[PDB]
Amino acid sequence: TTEIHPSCVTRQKVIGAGEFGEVYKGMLKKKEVPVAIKTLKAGYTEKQRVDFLGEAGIMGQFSHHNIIRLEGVISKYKPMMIITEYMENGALDKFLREKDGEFSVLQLVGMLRGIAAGMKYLANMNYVHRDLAARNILVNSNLVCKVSDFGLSRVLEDDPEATYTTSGGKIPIRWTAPEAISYRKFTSASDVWSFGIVMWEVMTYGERPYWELSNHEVMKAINDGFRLPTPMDCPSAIYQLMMQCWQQERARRPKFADIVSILDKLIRA
Ligand SMILES: COc1cc2c(Oc3ccc(NC(=O)C4(C(=O)Nc5ccc(F)cc5)CC4)cc3F)ccnc2cc1OCCCN1CCOCC1
């Protein structure tokens, strides 16, 4: 994992903030390159500093067009920084809502193909995402979609003195396959279930899955056999692909390799 020299980075503008810390737009110096810069909140524990840097090391392993690129880290000075390629259009779910109705079906299917190609790469690396959702897909100015994991599932509001703490990150119920909710059996096939949910987010221009249902209401519906309905102006072939992703038996779900091929074929026809 590349350590970046602080003289090569300038922070220009905060573009997001929370209890993790902040995200900035900045430049990385060759002509300079725009970057996102994620910082660590002041007062982190040694566990948080190690985890923060450990996540950057995980991201640095990947090298794919449809996976957010890590330029490097600043770990030797404060504030510590994770420095990534900049994605002009931000998160996909927000982007689609801002662009409601403004894309052709072919363009939306192209976004899904890019996400699937990133996931196929992750699957071939034996990496299970566990939080595949449009909020974790980033969009650049050319509308290229790239897989990321900011780590929202691993922010914990546990009291530092609590008797009971969350172990192993929280799970996004509306995005998670049934065998992963029940038995914590997370695999690429449970990611494929999540991909089907992303397909529905995309074809609805960012509707919240099951929005009228509580989390328990969602798990009951799925267990009763309910599946998200066909969005208006969703082609039949795309909805069939969604339904295959949502097969109760994980062995019957397509592989990300298959999804990429299926989407490629539709795009050429
Ligand atoms: C808040 O706004 C933005 C945040 C961005 C961003 O943030 C991050 C996302 C993920 C990570 N990931 C990580 O820190 C990690 C990760 O992703 N690991 C990982 C794990 C698995 C995997 F497959 C890939 C990556 C943990 C390391 C780090 C980030 F800093 C990265 C790139 N571009 C961004 C653009 C943003 O707005 C652009 C302007 C949008 N406008 C729209 C219109 O309204 C105004 C705003």
Q: From the alpha-carbon coordinates, what is the Rg to the nearest angstrom?
A: 19 Å
Oligomer: monomer
Domain count: 2
Question: Strand fraction band?
Answer: 5-15%
Would you count the extended β strands for me? 7
- CATH-defined topology of the largest domain: Transferase(Phosphotransferase), domain 1
Distinct helical segment count: 8
Active site: 131
Organism: Homo sapiens
Modified residues (Phosphoserine): 261
Domain Protein kinase: 9-267
Provide the descriptors you would attach to this structure in a database record:
two-stranded antiparallel ribbon, globular, binds the ligand COc1cc2c(Oc3ccc(NC(=O)C4(C(=O)Nc5ccc(F)cc5)CC4)cc3F)ccnc2cc1OCCCN1CCOCC1, five-stranded antiparallel β-sheet, alpha+beta, Transferase(Phosphotransferase), domain 1, 269 residues, 7 strands, Phosphorylase Kinase, domain 1
Structure, briefly:
Belongs to the protein kinase superfamily. Tyr protein kinase family. Ephrin receptor subfamily. Helix content is 36%, strand content 14%.
